[PDB]
Ligand binder design. Structure first.
Ligand SMILES: [K+]
Ligand SMILES: [K+]
Ligand SMILES: [K+]
Ligand SMILES: [K+]
Ligand SMILES: [K+]
Ligand SMILES: [K+]
Ligand SMILES: [K+]
Ligand SMILES: [K+]
Ligand SMILES: [Mg+2]
Ligand SMILES: [Mg+2]
Ligand SMILES: [Mg+2]
Ligand SMILES: [Mg+2]
Ligand SMILES: [Mg+2]
Ligand SMILES: [Mg+2]
Ligand SMILES: [Mg+2]
Ligand SMILES: [Mg+2]
Ligand SMILES: [Mg+2]
Ligand SMILES: [Mg+2]
Ligand SMILES: [Mg+2]
Ligand SMILES: [Mg+2]
Ligand SMILES: [Mg+2]
Ligand SMILES: [Mg+2]
Ligand SMILES: [Mg+2]
Lengths: 41, 95, 252, 291, 85, 110, 87, 97
RNA sequence: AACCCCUAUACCUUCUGCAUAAUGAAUUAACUAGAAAUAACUUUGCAAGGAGAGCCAAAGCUAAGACCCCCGAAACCAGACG
């Protein structure tokens, strides 16, 4: 049985929704946003 | 240690252990003293008597020897006129 | 006209009394209450052990499972012998084989390595106890009906379906006859054409089927059969060799 | 009665038991641990560098190069010849009396290994160098049963207990093949082999089984009366005259030294399927099985 | 997949098909037989059981032949069963 | 397993005694093992936790727990620590009391 | 539906084909025939006379016993000699 | 990207097909059938796995022993190599000793 | 009231200690790394016995649950090809 993540889209949106009002690529690129969102929190 | 043999997929005994230690069924291991046959001419009677004693191993060593031997060596045996028969079972041991 | 009054053959413990169930028939729509049968309390009134039902149900599902899933390790993927580029000097990450699990098209690091067996056996006594629990649960929840025989007036499946509806036997019914060879032809024809009404011999009874089917129907000969086999487990010695070999008092 | 009857009438008012509402008993399904997430990921419980994290620590028993404990101890023959040492499962008089009181062993007939095994009184393992049962004295004070028992070894006090009550005790040798057959006869009969002869004791055991003090099966019957009287004198009881007992014939029943089973001779083939016995008539075969 | 027959049996199967099938029965029997050669380069035990000195117990003994290499030139002579070791 | 033979006098030389007939009139019953013995078993864990188990208990196991607590309280000097398992019909007791419980259960007639 | 006939132990002796290459060699020997007779008796069809050792087999059996199993008199005599030497 | 834009076709499962309806029947063939047959004899599959369980190393050893002589050349080579790799892993590597 | 005001020395790895001018990383998507015995523990079964021949047993025994990663050298050897 091969299992693959099917709802990764929603997992990404949990972080990016908090980064929409950021400047630059860190408002859309998860790798960048997640670090800045943590710092924001 | 060989945890899974190539022919049977079973644990193996370290036979070096079998040649040196006696396992009492209660879990204790008995051994001789290192050097008990070495340079007796330079050793005192009291020291030589200590070296002749059959002594017990500690917890850590007992755990190690148990791992290095398969279940066969831990079964209860009923050898006829076994010199160690009395020592296989503990008495009045608390905790 | 005379009531069919069945009594428990095997000795019942003195501190316990038999439980009872109506004896019914399938010969007519209203042919309920044809008799009254006593049932051994240690088979049909044991402690309701739902945890043991889980054990036996899970054993049944898995003991005969063999998984055929298999993947290739980095050693079994085609090619991949040579080092793709020198260790140093290229500015690239160091690699030893194009079939490494890091590579597209490479081997699988910790994939399935079938065929894989799941065989295991619960103690015989535990599997026997599970059957006792399943029978008691069916009786305790009014899902057990005892029949004198499985003979129907006709072989039409609609009759049996209508009979269950009128008698409020739920959506699915498990029908247990004593022996495969001696099953009445009428019930054989009706059940063969149905999906939720399934006919099995007594030797085929099992917990999974009993739980899947809402209603359980047993013939009176089947009841005697089951009590004998299941209670034998309670009073038997530890075996000296497999019970298939000759014993003084076994079989029967 | 708040248990059985309360647990079943309470089930009447609950939903039907089905495959959708089953669960394991609490405590029987310990959770599985996976190296995923902050707590269990990162270094995943393996530590940092070294052989530890990389999985290459040395073999069990290795001490880092110091001459290990299990090697620096001198060799000594504690276990030398262990696999050739004869073993005897002990059977106490307490256990024997217990089995008789519960009807598991019948004292009205001769008691041998077969009856002891069939009563689940003792478990014999011929593959583990068990040579039979040794009758031990434990329980002699309270042993009351009168028995004719055949064992492989018997203590002097155990013998006295048997014979104070009017019973008979004999010590009988079984070779490894014979012991397997006598313990589990039915598996042997399914092999379709002629009943073999019981081998004689090894030379080192011949003195034991030819001595009346041990009630050896190869000892001179004329010497038993004196041996039986000595124990009666030593332990302060009067030797009963078993010749006057109603069970005297049964008490005297003994196997021939070459016979595995009572009433069955070497070289007989048991046909269990047809419930018959096949006896060879060839003179050469009869000489082999009778010698 | 697996083969229906073990590979070591393949040669014997070939003898049951084709022209080999039609060979004389007496000849095919001579091919199948594989008697043990007489011991030349090793000394046979001479018994089936021996007493082991170390433990003093009766042990079964077996004669394991020494592999012998017969050079092709041996087939034009008469070496008496001797070959290269 | 054969049923135990009839004996003129009880207890037998080994000490075995059959269950009283009729059964005692108590809220609970304790069934004998298949070997016809009282189901009281010593148990140990961790090399130090000595425990006693009464098995095959039917009826009101809580009534048995109270009776056991009263019976053992004088011997211990305090209330015994116990665990009641209604599902399995088992009472678990801290400490070794097998001999005392066996005789005590036999006197009740189980 | 109706369940299939229960799986039963197919009765009767099973005699494999001796000329089949895939027949296990252990199912073709005399030891296999003896087990069939013990299990099924006369229905086996095994000549009961083939159960005892043949004349040649009986000669080998008697030779091994003579070599490795001495008589009581021999063992007793050997014991006496050993005891005298020790004394 | 990476997520489908339409619903997949609905999953139709016939819970009362003959296979599901008769699942488990004869699992007590021995207990209810005088022990003439063991339930393990109902297991169907590879000849080296019927009524037996083991870890991957044990399975590999068992298969080579029972059917190695019938395996294809390439398959047997991989099997021998797998046995060697697993022998080294289980006997020499790991956290515990 | 977007900014202006105030507060705030990216992250991972590696270390006695890193904003460090120590390591890796343009970004997105997908893929990519903890495998099992010895004992012990927990929860059932039966219990001086347990186990569906073997084994264990001075409360044991049977069954189950639950712990042991990934990538990388320079090399060594065999058989081919130049
Ligand atoms: K030794
Ligand atoms: K962590
Ligand atoms: K931490
Ligand atoms: K390892
Ligand atoms: K890094
Ligand atoms: K710096
Ligand atoms: K720095
Ligand atoms: K640098
Ligand atoms: Mg490769
Ligand atoms: Mg290379
Ligand atoms: Mg490499
Ligand atoms: Mg691939
Ligand atoms: Mg990280
Ligand atoms: Mg690191
Ligand atoms: Mg370090
Ligand atoms: Mg315990
Ligand atoms: Mg530094
Ligand atoms: Mg700083
Ligand atoms: Mg930096
Ligand atoms: Mg650096
Ligand atoms: Mg693991
Ligand atoms: Mg080298
Ligand atoms: Mg080379």
């Amino acid at each position: 049985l091969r299992n693959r993540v099917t709802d990764r889209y929603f997992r990404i949106q949990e972080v990016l929704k908090h980064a929409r009002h950021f400047r630059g690529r860190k408002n859309r690129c998860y790798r960048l946003a997640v670090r800045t969102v943590i710092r924001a929190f | 240690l060989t945890y899974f043999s190539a022919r049977k997929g079973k644990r193996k005994t370290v036979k070096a252990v079998i040649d040196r230690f006696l396992r009492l069924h209660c879990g204790l291991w008995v051994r001789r003293k290192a050097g008990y046959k070495k340079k007796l001419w330079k050793k005192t009677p009291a020291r030589k008597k200590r070296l002749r004693e059959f002594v017990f191993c500690n917890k850590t060593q007992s755990k190690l020897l148990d791992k290095m031997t398969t279940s066969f060596w831990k079964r209860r045996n009923w050898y006829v006129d076994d010199p160690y028969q009395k020592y296989h079972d503990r008495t009045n041991l608390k905790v | 006209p005379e009531p069919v009054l069945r009594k428990v053959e095997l000795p019942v413990p003195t501190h316990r009394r038999p439980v009872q169930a109506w004896v019914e028939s399938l010969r007519g729509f209203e042919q309920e209450r044809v008799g009254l049968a006593d049932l051994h309390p240690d088979v049909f009134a044991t402690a309701p052990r739902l945890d043991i039902l889980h054990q036996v149900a899970m054993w049944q599902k898995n003991f005969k499972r063999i998984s055929y899933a298999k993947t290739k390790t980095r050693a079994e993927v085609r090619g991949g012998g040579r080092k793709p580029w020198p260790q140093k000097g290229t500015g690239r990450a160091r690699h030893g084989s194009i079939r490494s699990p890091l590579w597209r098209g490479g081997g699988v690091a910790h994939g399935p390595r079938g065929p894989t067996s799941y065989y295991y056996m619960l103690p015989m006594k535990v599997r026997a106890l599970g059957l006792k629990v399943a029978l008691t649960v069916k009786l305790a929840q009014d899902d057990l009906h005892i029949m004198d025989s499985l003979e129907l007036p006709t072989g039409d499946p609609q009759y049996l379906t209508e009979l269950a509806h009128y008698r409020r036997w739920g959506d699915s019914v498990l029908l247990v006859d004593l022996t495969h060879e001696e099953m009445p032809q009428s019930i054989v024809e009706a059940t063969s054409r149905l999906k939720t009404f399934n006919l099995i011999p007594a030797v085929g009874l099992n917990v999974h089927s009993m739980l899947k089917h809402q209603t359980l129907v047993l013939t009176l000969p089947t009841v005697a059969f089951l009590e004998d086999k299941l209670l034998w487990q309670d009073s038997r010695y530890r075996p000296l060799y497999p019970f298939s070999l000759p014993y003084s008092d076994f079989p029967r | 009665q708040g248990g059985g009857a309360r647990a079943l009438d309470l089930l009447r008012g609950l939903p039907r038991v089905s495959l959708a509402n089953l669960k394991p008993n609490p405590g029987s399904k310990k959770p599985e641990r996976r190296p995923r997430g902050r707590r269990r990921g990162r270094k995943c419980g393996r530590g940092h560098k070294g052989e530890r994290q990389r999985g290459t620590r040395p073999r069990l028993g290795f001490e880092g190069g110091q001459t290990p404990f299990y090697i620096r101890i001198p060799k000594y023959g504690f276990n030398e010849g262990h696999s050739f040492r004869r073993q005897y499962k002990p059977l106490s008089l307490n256990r024997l009396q217990y089995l008789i009181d519960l009807g598991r062993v019948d004292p009205s007939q001769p008691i041998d290994l077969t009856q002891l095994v069939n009563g689940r009184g003792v478990t014999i393992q011929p593959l583990k160098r068990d040579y039979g049962v040794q009758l031990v004295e434990e329980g002699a004070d309270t042993f009351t049963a009168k028995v004719n028992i055949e064992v492989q070894l018997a203590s002097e006090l155990a013998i006295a207990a048997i014979e104070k009550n009017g019973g008979v005790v004999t010590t009988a040798f079984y070779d490894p093949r014979s012991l397997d057959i006598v313990c589990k006869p039915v598996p042997f009969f399914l092999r379709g082999q002629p009943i073999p002869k019981r081998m004689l004791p090894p030379e080192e055991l011949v003195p034991y089984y030819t001595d009346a003090k041990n009630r050896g099966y190869l000892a001179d019957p004329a010497k038993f009366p004196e041996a039986r009287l000595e124990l009666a004198r030593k332990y302060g009881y009067i030797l009963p005259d078993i010749t006057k007992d109603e069970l005297f014939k049964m008490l005297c029943t003994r196997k021939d030294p070459r016979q595995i089973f009572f009433g069955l001779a070497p070289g007989w083939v048991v046909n269990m399927a047809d419930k018959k016995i096949l006896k060879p008539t060839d003179e050469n075969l009869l000489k082999y099985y009778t010698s | 997949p697996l083969h229906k027959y073990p590979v070591w049996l393949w040669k014997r199967l070939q003898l049951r098909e084709g022209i080999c099938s039609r060979l004389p029965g007496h000849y095919l029997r001579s091919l199948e037989e594989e008697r043990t050669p007489t011991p030349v380069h090793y000394r046979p035990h001479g018994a089936k059981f021996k007493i082991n000195p170390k433990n003093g117990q009766r042990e079964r003994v077996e004669d394991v032949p020494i592999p012998i290499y017969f050079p092709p030139e041996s087939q034009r002579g008469l070496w008496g069963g001797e070959g290269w070791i | 397993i054969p049923d135990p033979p009839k004996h003129e006098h009880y207890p037998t030389p080994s000490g075995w005694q059959p269950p009283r007939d009729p059964p005692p009139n108590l809220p609970y019953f304790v069934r004998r093992s298949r070997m016809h013995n009282i189901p009281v078993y010593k148990d140990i864990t961790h090399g130090n936790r000595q425990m006693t188990v009464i098995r095959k208990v039917e009826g009101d196991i809580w009534a048995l727990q109270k009776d056991v607590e009263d019976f053992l309280s004088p011997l211990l000097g305090k209330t015994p620590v116990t665990q009641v398992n209604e599902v399995t019909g088992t009472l678990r007791i801290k400490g070794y009391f097998d001999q005392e419980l066996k005789a005590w259960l036999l006197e009740k007639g189980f | 539906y109706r369940a299939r006939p229960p799986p039963r132990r197919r009765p009767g002796p099973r005699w494999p084909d001796p000329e089949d290459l895939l027949t296990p060699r252990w199912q073709l020997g005399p030891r296999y025939a003896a087990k069939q007779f013990a299990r099924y008796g006369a229905a086996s069809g095994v000549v009961p006379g083939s159960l005892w050792p043949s004349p040649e087999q009986l000669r080998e059996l008697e030779a091994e016993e003579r070599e490795w199993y001495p008589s009581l008199a021999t063992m007793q005599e050997s014991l006496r000699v050993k005891q005298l030497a020790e004394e | 990207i990476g997520i489908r834009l339409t619903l997949p076709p609905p999953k139709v499962v016939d819970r009362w097909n003959e296979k599901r309806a008769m699942f488990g029947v004869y699992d007590n063939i021995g207990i209810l059938g005088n022990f003439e047959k063991h339930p393990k004899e109902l297991i169907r599959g590879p000849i080296w796995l019927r009524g037996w369980k083991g870890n991957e190393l044990q399975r590999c050893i068992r298969k080579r022993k029972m059917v190695g002589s019938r395996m294809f050349a390439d398959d047997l080579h991989n099997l021998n190599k797998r046995i060697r790799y697993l022998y080294k892993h289980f006997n020499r590597h790991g956290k515990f000793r």
